[PDB]
Amino acid sequence: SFEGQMAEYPTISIDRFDRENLRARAYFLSHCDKDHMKGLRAPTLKRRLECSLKVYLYCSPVTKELLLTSPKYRFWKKRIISIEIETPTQISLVDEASGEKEEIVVTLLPAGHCPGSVMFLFQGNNGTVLYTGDFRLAQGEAARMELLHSGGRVKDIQSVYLDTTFCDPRFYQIPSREECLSGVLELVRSWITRSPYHVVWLNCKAAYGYEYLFTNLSEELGVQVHVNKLDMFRNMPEILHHLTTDRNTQIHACRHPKAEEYFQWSKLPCGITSRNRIPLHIISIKPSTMWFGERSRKTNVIVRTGESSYRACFSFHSSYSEIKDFLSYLCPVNAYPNVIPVGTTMDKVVEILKPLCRS
Ligand SMILES: [Zn+2]
Question: Distance, CA 76 to ligand 1 centroid (Å)?
Answer without folding.
Answer: 33
